[PDB]
């Protein structure tokens, strides 16, 4: 409603770096807000794509940003009569970024990994890796829970059980208020998908460079399954956290598996021990229900509510014809210990192939009316198909069925305006929470500042 679509702010990265593929707000120890941006196709030293991260200071003018430097060299360690190998070529560093405290976590879901022993190998596969940094101190660390030293032969002899070779850890990411990192690994356990959790403190204190294979004792990985419903489900395509069990001391995880149960799609809510509390099933096959998830109390009862995106949902129209437009589902948490019922609201896109629901960002209370609001992206929506972001306001009964404001892409066609979003942070410190929008197709980020309500 009260975002400013006239005077925007533009940050930009290198051409063809997909600058803006992922982003987040970052507050230093002094409380100064910045914008971290992932550019998963940024060139490295060997003039090859490796990805990269940028830490943009807040300036109303915008402009170029300084790199947040990480190690981009391929590593090798001959140890235990084995040879450990990491390959960072086309790893996609910055394919996801998240900030917590004065710490930044940027991940390369496609960092490859192999182990050699004489003539055998563990196979060169994308286990993924996460790079962590404390900019003010310069401290660095890594986390790659899916790395292993098991040989190809063993996996075959054990019928490919607990195969973490393709985890692609860092695909999605989130951090609990307690400082516990949680990585979605859609390729884990042979493309079933897994989650990997570990305290940020324990990551830094257990990491040393050159080791490549090290133990993080406090970590916690989810489990393999014999159930075909989970096969090729990409469990961990998206991840979020919240409070859904009434216990304020426990933290619950929200996981998206958009191809769960033969492309039906699903979202699961779990305790910190990965025991399932709820499961939301997709309404339509191949809709990619669970492509994106968001957690925020929209109706002001102090109970978190769940939003789920199905960007490829095909709406039923006249003459038995369908039209891919995307859809968003709202699930309001009930009072006390009860199961999340049917969707409280269905928001459906209008533009064909617009992919409404590709991204969903909590805005906090935008108009300051007392109910938290959200922003939904249709990256190829709008009349021009250039992309749109739609704002929906909270209310006593959930959300408004109609948008209060629509942000048309200021970029050219193919910019994927809205593919990444983030809100609920006051960046100019005017008392109103603001919205940052990524457009990797254009290698830029747009900042929308919230003003007083007209």
């Amino acid at each position, epitope marked *: 409603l009260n975002l400013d679509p006239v005077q925007l702010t533009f940050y930009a990265g290198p051409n063809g770096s997909q600058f803006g593929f992922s982003l987040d707000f970052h507050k230093d120890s002094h409380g100064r807000v910045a914008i971290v941006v992932g550019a998963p196709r940024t060139l490295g030293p060997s003039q090859e794509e490796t990805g990269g991260v940028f830490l943009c200071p807040w300036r109303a003018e915008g402009g170029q940003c300084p790199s947040l430097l990480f190690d981009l060299r391929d590593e090798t*360690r*001959n*140890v*235990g*009569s084995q040879t450990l190998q990491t390959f960072k070529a086309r790893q996609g560093l910055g394919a996801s970024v998240v900030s917590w405290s004065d710490v930044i976590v940027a991940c390369a879901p496609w960092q490859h990994w192999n182990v050699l022993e004489k003539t055998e190998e563990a196979e060169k596969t994308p286990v993924g890796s996460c790079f962590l940094a404390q900019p003010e101190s310069g401290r660095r660390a890594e986390y790659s829970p899916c790395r292993g*030293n098991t040989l190809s032969r*063993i996996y075959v002899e*054990n019928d490919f059980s607990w195969d973490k070779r393709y985890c692609e850890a860092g695909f999605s990411s989130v951090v609990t208020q307690a400082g516990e990192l949680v990585l979605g690994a859609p390729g884990g356990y042979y493309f079933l998908g897994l989650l990997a959790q570990a305290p940020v403190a324990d990551i830094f204190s*257990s*990491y*040393r460079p*050159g*080791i490549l*294979l*090290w*133990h993080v*004792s406090s970590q916690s990985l989810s489990f393999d399954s014999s159930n075909p419903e989970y096969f090729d489900g990409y469990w961990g395509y998206s991840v979020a956290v919240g409070e859904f069990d009434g216990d304020l001391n426990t933290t619950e995880y929200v996981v998206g598996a958009p191809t769960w149960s033969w492309t039906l799609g699903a979202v699961e809510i779990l305790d910190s021990y990965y025991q399932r509390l709820h499961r939301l099933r997709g309404e339509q096959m191949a809709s990619y229900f669970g492509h994106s998830v968001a957690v925020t109390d929209v109706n002001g009862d102090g109970r978190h509510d769940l939003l789920v995106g199905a960007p490829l949902y095909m709406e039923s129209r006249a003459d038995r014809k369908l039209a891919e437009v995307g859809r968003v589902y709202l699930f309001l948490q009930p009072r006390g210990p009860h199961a999340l019922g049917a969707p409280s609201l269905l928001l459906t896109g209008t533009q064909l192939y617009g992919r409404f629901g590709s991204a969903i960002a909590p805005l906090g209370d935008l108009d300051r009316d007392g109910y938290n609001d959200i922003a939904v992206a249709a990256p190829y929506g709008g009349p021009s198909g250039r992309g749109q972001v739609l704002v929906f306001l909270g209310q006593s009964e959930g959300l408004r069925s109609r948008p209060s404001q629509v942000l048309d892409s200021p970029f050219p066609t193919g910019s994927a305006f809205g593919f990444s979003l983030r809100g609920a942070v006051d960046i100019d410190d005017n008392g109103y929470p603001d919205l940052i929008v990524g457009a990797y197709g254009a290698n830029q980020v747009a900042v929308y500042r919230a003003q007083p309500v007209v």
Partner: antibody
Amino acid sequence: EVQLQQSGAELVKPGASVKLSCTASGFNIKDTYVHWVKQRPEQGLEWIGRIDPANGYTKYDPKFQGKATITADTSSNTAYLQLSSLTSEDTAVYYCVRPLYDYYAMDYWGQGTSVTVSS
Amino acid sequence: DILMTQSPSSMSVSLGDTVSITCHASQGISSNIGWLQQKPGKSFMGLIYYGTNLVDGVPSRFSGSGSGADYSLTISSLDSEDFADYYCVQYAQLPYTFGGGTKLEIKR
């Protein structure tokens, strides 16, 4: 806190067999490798072998192939070292070892188990 | 197997002295080495891993260094507790192998 609590001192005859233990405390035995090391005053320290208690796969120094047999039961959180066809040279102190962070290191040590073979 | 020649076998030194134990491998081991401490009539405690990294709880007066096949353990300002046995261990290859050992003794 990590502590490796091995069995008490054993006292056996030659030709017999013995099975030591190494119970984990403050952690899960399954997390890391578990090595066994032999110590004598003259010959010094020697590496017997290792095991990954998560799957039971083992490795041995070809010197101890036949005498040493390393195993583990994740249930009791314990790792074992069986010795067979004992002799006077097997008279030594035996330690179980696991790494701290590095997958391949040798950092945490149990108090040790004294063995004496004699008729 | 890889041999580990640890030297010296022993040394007579006093409190506050700075000393250095060395270790020579039969081939390159690229910093894949660990240092150990066995106090008289007791078990072992980890000091170093991967050549230079201090084990948790270990004072910073200890320090590891070296590369290739030559490595060293240095103790700045000897404490009364530091008088004990020390061993180096390589894990570049299986089987793991240890050094002959080094014993620190009080000089007089």
